[PDB]
Each structure stands twice: as structure tokens, then as C-alpha cells.
């Protein structure tokens, strides 16, 4: 597995919280994925074609901004 990074914009509750992981779920190649709510930010863990841009995105198309640390 390669892992991630991701400082979350818009997520004001654990309920944005849920939403986050799981549009990043549904990106092909991710694994696993652990937002952390406290410090606003997901650790994704992935494989297969995911890019941390193709991450970036799905956090875009689900409402929320992220950018790659
Ligand atoms: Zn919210």
C-alpha cells in the first residue's frame, strides 16, 4: 500500500466526517481511509491507479476542498 495525506476544508461535523470517508472509499484503487475529525485531515492508504489528485477530487465532487500534504 502507498498512504496519504489530505487537509479537509468543510467539515464542520462527524456527520461531513462520514461523508468524506466515503466518497474516498468509493475511488478505485483506495483501501482504507481514516478521517481524523480533530485535526481535519484523512489518511488514505491505496493502491491500483489512485492519485492524490484523483483523491483531491472525489473530496471536490462530494462538497468539501481538500489539498495534498
Ligand atoms: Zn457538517
Sequence with gaps: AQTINLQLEGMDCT???????????????????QVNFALEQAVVSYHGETTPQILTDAVERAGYHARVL
Design 15 to 33: 456527520s461531513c466526517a462520514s461523508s468524506i470517508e466515503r466518497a474516498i472509499a468509493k475511488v478505485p484503487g483506495v483501501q482504507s481511509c
